[PDB]
């Protein structure tokens, strides 16, 4: 059977990076050589495998992760990277085997006056394990005084909303990301 990639890339709404979606696909066939030469993708970097020879390999399941970040944070979706996204939102392994696809979505995810639906994790006591998802909204205890779920001093909501306006810079404009990882 064919890989339902149209439901992932051409999806109308993407998830926030702190709650990145994952689509588990069950051993299908797809023309990966068609997706590479598509001008819709401004970022397409594969690690451990070449984009053209993907149709020449087999696997048990291919995982399709999807989220939205700003332009400057696209460089973090790569093995051995650090930052607010790579540490507290989405982390790829150092030995990552797959591809990183991204495209500008200012015409889709930016609203005049700001689209604040997409969020990211700003505070976390430790970095994320590879392919880990942290969706907890517990109040971040920055000091020694506990918070009791009440925002205030030394008590911060661990998430912050992206300010996606059409007039923002490309590094701050929304970029939809899709990561393909394989399982042998």
């Amino acid at each position: 059977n064919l890989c339902p990639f149209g439901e992932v890339f051409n999806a109308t709404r993407f998830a926030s990076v702190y709650a990145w979606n994952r689509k588990r696909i069950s051993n299908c066939v797809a023309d990966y050589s068609v997706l590479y030469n598509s001008a819709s993708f401004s970022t397409f970097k594969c690690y451990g495998v070449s984009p053209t020879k993907l149709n020449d390999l087999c696997f048990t399941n291919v995982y399709a992760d999807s989220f939205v970040i700003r332009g400057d944070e696209v460089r973090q979706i790569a093995p051995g990277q650090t930052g607010k996204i790579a540490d507290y939102n989405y982390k790829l392994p150092d030995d990552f085997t797959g591809c990183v696809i991204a495209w500008n979505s200012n015409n889709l995810d930016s609203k005049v006056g700001g689209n604040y639906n997409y969020r990211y994790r700003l505070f976390r006591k430790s970095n994320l394990k590879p392919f880990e998802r942290d969706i907890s909204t517990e109040i971040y205890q920055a000091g020694s005084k506990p918070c009791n779920g009440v925002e205030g001093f030394n008590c911060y909501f661990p998430l912050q909303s992206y300010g996606f306006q059409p007039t923002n810079g490309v590094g701050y404009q929304p970029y939809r990301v899709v990561v393909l990882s394989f399982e042998l």
Partner: antibody, heavy 118, light 110 residues
């Protein structure tokens, strides 16, 4: 209380090493974004380095390869190891906790001076 | 880096009058800007964050405004304790860094 007491500054010959301390009170260093800001005498403020609560470290292009930020959770003290110092690095160094859009850079250290001469 | 330009470099105001300080960013920083007051020989003190939100314990005479590339710090009635250097700071590049303005010196007019 909320306090960022510093120490370790003084005179250092160009090219040597010097380590600054930033003892924290009430604020946990291992749980916050902790930065190092230096201010050249008579100039503006310049961000030097920053460590994440998760252990990630970032440095400015003017101190890359020469400076190293670290911390000690037992003593609850932020540190900054300065190597290969030159006449540039002569400034008053501050340490501060950063909150971004949740309070900016609210609390600062009192400042320790680093003088580089021969 | 995003360059922050404060105007004027020096502002001579009498006590009780209004002091207005501007700070322009070379690129859009939305509302991610903070203001600080630094007295001689002392560490900076946060006055405004989020372009307009007063920090805890800051008198009501201080107020911030502006967005994107233009920002303003206003002291409605200048007091004798308010004569110091003032710095703006963008933190739209906070995921790692941040930049300050060159500073504005508020001094007693004569």
């Amino acid at each position: 209380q909320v306090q960022l007491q510093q120490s370790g500054g003084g005179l250092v010959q160009p090219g040597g090493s010097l380590r600054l301390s930033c003892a924290a009170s009430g604020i946990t260093v291992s749980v916050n974004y902790m930065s190092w800001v230096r201010q050249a005498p008579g100039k503006g403020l310049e961000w030097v380095s920053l460590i994440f609560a998760g252990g990630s470290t970032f440095y400015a292009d003017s101190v890359k390869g020469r400076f190293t930020i670290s911390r000690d959770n037992s003593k609850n003290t932020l540190f900054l190891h300065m190597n290969s110092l030159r006449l540039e690095d002569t400034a008053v160094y501050y340490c501060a906790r950063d909150l971004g859009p949740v309070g900016a850079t609210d609390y600062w250290g009192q400042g320790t001076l680093v003088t580089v001469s021969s | 880096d995003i360059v922050m330009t404060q105007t004027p470099a020096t502002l001579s105001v009498s006590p009780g009058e209004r002091a207005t300080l501007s700070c322009r960013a070379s690129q859009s920083v939305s509302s991610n800007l903070a203001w600080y007051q630094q007295k001689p020989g002392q560490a900076p003190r946060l006055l405004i964050y989020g372009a307009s939100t007063r920090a805890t314990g800051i008198p009501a005479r201080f107020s911030g405004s502006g967005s994107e590339t233009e920002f303003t710090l206003t002291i409605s009635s200048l007091q004798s304790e308010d004569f110091a250097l003032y710095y703006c700071q963008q933190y739209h590049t906070w995921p790692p860094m941040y930049t300050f303005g060159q500073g504005t010196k508020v001094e007693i007019k004569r």
